[PDB]
Design an enzyme around this catalytic site. Structure first.
Site, short mmCIF file in Angstrom:
data_model
loop_
_atom_site.label_atom_id
_atom_site.label_comp_id
_atom_site.label_asym_id
_atom_site.label_seq_id
_atom_site.Cartn_x
_atom_site.Cartn_y
_atom_site.Cartn_z
N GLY A 145 0.79 -1.22 0.00
CA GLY A 145 0.00 0.00 0.00
C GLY A 145 0.83 1.27 0.00
O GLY A 145 1.99 1.26 -0.36
N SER A 179 5.62 -5.89 1.14
CA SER A 179 5.96 -4.51 0.98
C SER A 179 5.68 -3.74 2.23
O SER A 179 6.17 -4.10 3.29
CB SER A 179 5.17 -3.94 -0.15
N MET A 180 4.80 -2.76 2.17
CA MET A 180 4.52 -2.00 3.38
C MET A 180 3.91 -2.89 4.44
O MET A 180 4.03 -2.61 5.63
CB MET A 180 3.59 -0.83 3.09
N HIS A 199 10.75 -4.96 -0.60
CA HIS A 199 11.35 -4.28 -1.75
C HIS A 199 11.38 -2.76 -1.63
O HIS A 199 10.53 -2.16 -0.96
CB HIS A 199 10.64 -4.69 -3.04
N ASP A 220 12.59 -7.51 -5.60
CA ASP A 220 11.68 -8.23 -4.74
C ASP A 220 12.32 -9.45 -4.11
O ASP A 220 12.76 -10.36 -4.80
CB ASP A 220 10.54 -8.74 -5.60
#
Lengths: 115, 116, 192, 192, 192, 192, 192, 192, 116
Positions: free
Chosen positions: C68, C97-98, C122, C171
Site C-alpha cells: 500500500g 511490501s509496506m 522491496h 523483490d
C-alpha cells in the site's frame, strides 16, 4: 466482598485476608502431606508404604488444577494409591501387614510393589 | 447525631423497613427506623450517607418529609422533623475527574462537580 | 449477513455484537487489504481506543496485506511506537511490501507468523511528470524516503544497513522459516 | 429480505436472528464464492470465535466454491490446523481448485460430500511482466508454491507425492465416488 | 417499504416481520430468478432450518425461474433428497431448464403447477477455450453431466431413458396439462 | 462493520457508540483525505458542536491530508479562529499543501507532529478558459489569493514575508525536524 | 459513520442524533454545494419547522456554495422573506452567484461574513436550441430574469440600479472588507 | 443525515420523526422534481391516507417542478378531484408543464403562488417510430390527449377554449402577477 | 385534603400500593394508601396531581370510584367515597393551543383544546 458486606461491617474489621491460588511448588508439598496421612492409616494395619520421587512428581502433575485448589490432590491420591491397597488389605497380600512401594514406569504407570 | 447509610437502603424492601410503611416495617413498631430516630431525638441532626445509592422510594420519602416536616409510622405515630437538620452526603461529584482521556495528548478532565 | 452477529452474556446481557466488534473487545485488530488513508485512519482510531481502555494490556494485530501507500502506513507505524501497551503482530496470509514493514514493527519478542505464510520486501516505488526542475525536487524526496525506510528495517531486524540495502534492490521473497532466520519475526505459531 | 429472520426460544427469548447468524450459533460456517482476502478474513474470525466458545466441540464447514486466491486460502488452512477442535468439512455443489484443497484439510474421518457434487484439482496459475531479471524472481516463487501445495495434498490424501504431481498437471475432475476412492473425502452422505 | 412485512399476535405480542420472514415461518420457501451460488446457498440454509424446527411436516417450495447454473442447482437437489420431511414443489409462472429439473424432484404425489404456467426442458449448455488437450478434458466432463441429468429425469418422471434423451435434444415446451401427462407433475391446482 | 462499535459504562452503561462518535465525545476530530466542500462542512459542524458543549476545553484535530480546494479549506481556517476554545493540531501521515496550511493554524504552542511525518508546501494552483478580458479578471483574483496566503504563513510561522515568498515558489518538502526548526510546528511527540 | 452521532441529556437522556439534527435543534441550518431543487426543498422545510417551534427567535444560515439554479434559489429566497423570525446569513468559504444572492437577502443588520471569505457576483447564464421563433421566446425570458435579479440586488444593497447593472456585466470578486463597503454584508465576524 | 430528525413532545414525550414525516402529520405534502410513476404513486398514497385521517380538513400541496409524464400526473389529478377535503396548492420556485396543470387543479379560491415564482405552459410532447399504419395510431392518440388537456385548462381557469388553444402553441411564460390575472392562481402570498 | 402524586405511579407494579397486596405476598399489611385514607376521613377533598402520567392500570381503578363511589381493599373492606370531592389536575391540552401549524397557511389552531 464489597458488594455483599456493607461498610458498617467492613470498617470494623481488622482486616480482610485474601488467600491465593496454589502453585505447582505448593502442590509438591501438598502431595507429601497427603502421602504421610496415608502412611499413618497404613501403620494401623502393619503396612509400610514407600512411594518414589518420580511417582510423586507424577501424581503432582496429574492432580494439578489451579481452579480447585488442593481438593483434587486428595482425589488423585485416593484413586491411585488407596484403591489397590484396599483390595490387598481386604482380600490379599496385605491382610497380615507387609511392605508396599511404588515405582514410576517409563510408560507413566504406577508400578506398584508386590508385598 | 442520627445516622443512616443509604447504600443499605438501596433495595425496595429495605426502603419500607426504614420508612415504617404499614407493611414491611421493622419489628412491630420499629417502625420506622427513621421515624423512631426523629421521635426520640426531635432536635437532632440527621445524616444520610452516600445518598446517590438510595433506592428511589427513599429519595421520595425524604422529599415528602422536606415538604411537610413529618413522617408517619406504621402504627400511626408521627415523627416531627421541624427541629432537625438534614445533612446528605455523596462522593459522586468528583468521580468524573478521576478519569484519564483518550488521545495522543491527555487532557484535563476536571469538571464542574455542581453540574455532576 | 455479510457480517454475522454473535451473542454473549454478562450482567444482564444479552447484547449482540457484529463479530468484528466482538473481537475488538478482546483487543484484536485486523489489518487487511491495501494500506490506504481511510483504512489507516480507522486503525489508528482503534489503537487509541484500546490504549485508553487499559494501558497495561497487549493489543494483537493480525496482518494480511499485499502492500500500500507509504504515508498511510507510516501513520500506523508512528502510533504503534507511541502508545504505551505492546502491540504484537501476527502475520497470516501475506505481508508484502509496506505490510512487511509494519509486521516487523511490533514489540520485540512478540512478532509471530503462521507456517504457510509469505513475506516479501522491496524498495519503494513512485514517479512524476513536469519541468526538469520539478523532476529534480521529486526525485530527491523519493530517495530520502528510501533511505529512511532502510534505516528502520535495520533497526528493527538487526541486520546491518548495507545488508538491508542489498536485499531490497529487487523483490525478495521469504518463507516463514526464512523470516525467522532473517530477523523479521521471532517465531512461528504451530498448534495450540 | 435478502436474508430472512428466524425466531428462536430460550428462557426469556424470543430473539430474532438473521438466518446465517442463527446457523453460526450451531457451529456452522459457510464458504461460498471466490476465495479472496476479505471473505477469507471473515471465515477466520468466525472460527476463532467458535473455538473460544467451546473448545471441545466440532465446527462444521460447508464448502461450495469455484476456487480463488491461494494466499487468502492459506490463511483459512492454517487456522484450521492451529485451533483445537476438529473441523469437519462438507462439500456440496462444487469444490474446485483452492476449494478442493481446503476440503481435504478437514479432520480425518470427517470429510464428507454429497452424491451429486464435483471436485476438481489443478496446479496453480500466475504471471508477470518486467525485466528478464524480475521475471526470474517471480518464476521461482510460483514454482516454490506449486511444490508446497503438492506436499500438502499428498499428506492429507495418502497418495504418494509422485502420484499427486502427475495428477495435477491438467484439470482433473472427480465425481463424488471418485473423491472417496482417491482419498479426498471419507464418505458420501445420502439420506438422513 | 421496498418489501412488505406484517404484524401478528401469538401471545405476548406481536411481533413484526418482513413479509418474507412471515411466510418462512409457515414453511414456505420461494425460488425465483436465476439459479446461482449465493441464492442457492440461502435456500439450503432455509431448508435445513425448517427440517430442524419440525421434522414431521412438509416444506413448500414455490418455483418461478428461467434456469441457471447446474452446480448451484444441484446443491439444492441434494439437500431436498437428504432431509427427512417431504418437499412439495409448486410451479407458477415458469419453470425452465434447471428450474424444471428441481420441480420434478419434489415428493411424489405432491408436485403441483398452476394452469397457465409453462415448463420447458433441454440438454445443458457450456463451452471452453484452450489447447486441444484441455478441450478434450472439458468436453468429456460436460458430457458426463448430461448423462447424469438424464438419468435423474428418467428416475423422477417414469419415462424410459431413451425417451428422455430424445426429448431434450432441443427446447421442449409443455403446457400445464402436458406436464401432467408427461409426468413432470402430478396435478393442476384450480380454485381453492 | 466498516466502522466497529464500542461500549462504555456510565450510570446505566448501556450505550454503544460508533468508534468515531466515541472519539468525538472526547473532543477528537479527524481530517483526512482531500479537502473539499462536503467534508469541510462536516468538520465545521463538529467544531461548532464542541464549542457549544464546553467553551473552556481544547479540541484536538488530527490531520492526515494530501491537500485540496482552497475555498473549502478556508472555511475551516476561519472557524478555528472564530470559535472560543483552542484547537490543537496534530500531524500524522502527511500534511500537504492545504493540509500544511491548516496545520500551522493551530493554537500556538500546541502544534505537534509525529516523527516520521512529512509536511509539504507550495503556491496555489488554478486555471481558466474564456475571453481575453475574462482571463484578466480571473488571473487577478488568483494572484490576490496567493498574496493573502503568503501573509498568513508569515504570521503563523514567524518567518519574514519575503522568506515565505521564496519558499513556496516550488514544492518544498520538510521532514518533521525541519518543520520544527522552520516554524511550522512547535514540537515532535515521541512516546507517551 | 460518515456523520457522527452525538448524545445529550434531558430527563432520561435517551437522545442520540446525527450531528446535523443536533444543530437544527439550536436553530442552525447549513447551505452547501450547488443550489438545486432537492436540496433547496429541504432547507425550506427546515425553516418552516423552526418558524413554528418559536416564531420569536433568530435562525442562523451558514452559506458556503458556488452557485446554482435560479429557480431553486428563489424558493429559498421567498421563504426567507415570508416567515416571521429573522434569518441571519453567515458567509464562510464562498458565496458565489446565486449563493451571493441569498447571502444579501438575510435580515438587515445581521448579514455577516468571516474575514477570509469571498463573494462573487455576475449576470445569469442560460441557453437554448430550436427554431428562430422559440429562440426569441427563450431569449426574452432570460432577459426578464436578469432585470428582476438586478432590482432585488439594488433593493437589498442600497446601490443604485444603474450601478448594479454596470457591476454584474463580468464576474466581480469582492473580499470580505469589500463586501462590507459595497453593501452585500453588514459586517465581519471576528471572534465569538 | 440527508434528512434530519426532529423531536416532538406529547404525553410520554417519545417521538422521533424524519422531518418529512413530521410535516405529513400537519397535512403537508411536497411535490418536487420530475413527475413520474413511482413518485406519483407515493403522492396518491399520502393523500388517501390524509383523507381518511380527517375528511373535514384541507390538505396542502407544495409544488416545485419542471414537468413530467402526463400519464403519471393524471393519477394525482384524479385523486385530488375524487377525495372529499379541499386540496390547496401552492406554487414556489416553478410550476412548468404538467406542474402547472396540477397547480390549477386545486380547490377554487385556494390556488396561491409566491411572488418570485414562474409558471410555464405548453402543448404536450411525444413521438414514435414504426410502420406508416402504426404511426397513424400513435399520432391520433397524442392529438386526443392534447384536446383533453385543453378542455381541462379551460374548465379550471375560466379562459375560453379557443384562448387556451392559442396560448399553448409555444412555450408561454407567466410571472406570478400574470398567473393571477390569467386565472391560473387566485392570489399571491406575501408576508406572514 | 388528601393528596396523591400520580407521578409516583407510572409503573405497573405500583398500583397495589394504593389498594394493598393480595394474601400471601410481601406488602400485604398495607390497607391501601388510598383506601386507608378515605376510610379514616370519609369527608375530604381528594386531589390527584398530574393525572396525565398515571400508569393506565390506575385509571382502571378510578373508573369504579367515579361511577359507584367505592373500592374494596385487600381485606375486603369498603372504601366509601360517596362523601368526597375528587379533583384531578392536568396540563394535557395546554401544549396544543400554544402552537401554530407548520406551513405558509395557518390552520385553525384553537379547536384542539379537546382532541388531545
Amino acid at each position: 466482598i464489597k458488594k455483599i458486606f456493607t461498610p458498617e461491617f467492613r470498617n470494623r474489621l481488622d482486616n480482610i485476608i485474601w488467600f491465593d491460588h496454589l502453585s505447582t511448588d505448593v502442590i509438591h508439598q501438598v502431595v507429601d502431606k497427603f502421602i504421610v496421612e496415608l502412611q499413618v492409616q497404613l501403620d494401623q494395619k502393619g503396612v509400610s508404604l514407600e512411594v518414589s520421587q518420580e511417582a510423586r512428581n507424577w501424581l503432582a502433575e496429574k492432580g494439578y488444577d489451579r481452579a480447585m485448589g488442593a481438593r483434587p490432590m486428595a482425589r488423585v491420591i485416593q484413586d491411585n494409591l488407596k484403591k489397590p491397597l484396599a483390595n490387598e488389605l481386604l482380600f490379599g497380600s496385605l491382610v497380615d501387614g507387609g511392605q508396599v512401594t511404588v515405582a514410576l514406569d517409563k510408560e507413566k504407570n504406577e508400578l506398584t510393589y508386590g508385598f | 447525631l442520627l445516622r443512616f447509610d443509604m447504600s443499605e437502603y438501596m433495595e425496595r424492601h429495605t426502603v419500607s423497613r426504614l420508612i415504617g410503611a404499614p407493611p414491611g416495617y421493622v419489628g412491630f413498631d420499629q417502625g420506622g427506623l427513621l421515624t423512631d430516630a426523629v421521635i426520640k431525638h426531635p432536635h437532632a441532626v440527621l445524616l444520610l450517607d452516600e445518598i446517590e445509592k438510595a433506592h428511589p422510594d427513599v429519595f421520595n420519602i425524604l422529599l415528602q418529609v422536606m415538604d411537610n416536616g413529618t413522617l408517619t409510622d406504621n402504627n400511626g405515630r408521627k415523627a416531627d422533623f421541624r427541629n432537625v437538620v438534614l445533612v446528605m452526603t455523596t462522593n459522586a461529584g468528583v468521580r468524573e475527574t478521576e478519569r484519564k482521556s483518550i488521545g495522543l495528548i491527555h487532557q484535563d478532565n476536571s469538571t464542574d462537580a455542581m453540574e455532576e | 449477513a455479510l457480517v454475522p452477529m454473535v451473542i454473549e452474556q454478562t450482567s444482564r446481557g444479552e447484547r449482540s455484537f457484529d463479530i468484528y466488534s466482538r473481537l475488538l473487545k478482546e483487543r484484536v485488530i485486523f489489518l487487511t487489504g491495501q494500506v490506504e488513508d481511510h483504512m489507516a485512519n480507522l486503525i489508528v482510531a482503534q489503537m487509541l481506543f484500546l490504549e485508553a481502555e487499559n494501558p497495561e494490556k497487549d493489543i494483537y494485530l493480525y496482518i494480511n496485506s499485499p502492500g500500500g501507500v507509504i504515508t498511510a502506513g507510516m501513520s500506523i507505524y508512528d502510533t504503534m511506537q507511541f502508545i504505551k501497551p505492546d502491540v504484537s503482530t501476527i502475520c497470516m496470509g501475506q505481508a508484502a511490501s509496506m505490510g512487511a514493514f509494519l509486521l516487523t514493527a511490533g514489540a520485540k519478542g512478540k512478532r509471530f507468523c503462521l507456517p504457510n505464510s509469505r513475506v516479501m520486501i522491496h524498495q519503494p516505488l513512485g514517479g512524476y511528470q513536469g519541468q526538469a526542475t520539478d523532476i529534480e525536487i521529486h526525485a530527491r524526496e523519493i530517495l530520502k524516503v528510501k533511505g529512511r525506510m532502510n534505516e528502520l528495517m535495520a533497526l528493527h531486524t538487526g541486520q546491518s544497513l548495507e545488508q538491508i540495502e542489498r536485499d531490497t534492490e529487487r523483490d525478495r521473497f521469504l518463507s516463514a522459516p526464512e523470516a525467522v532466520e532473517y530477523g523479521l519475526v521471532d517465531s512461528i505459531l504451530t498448534h495450540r
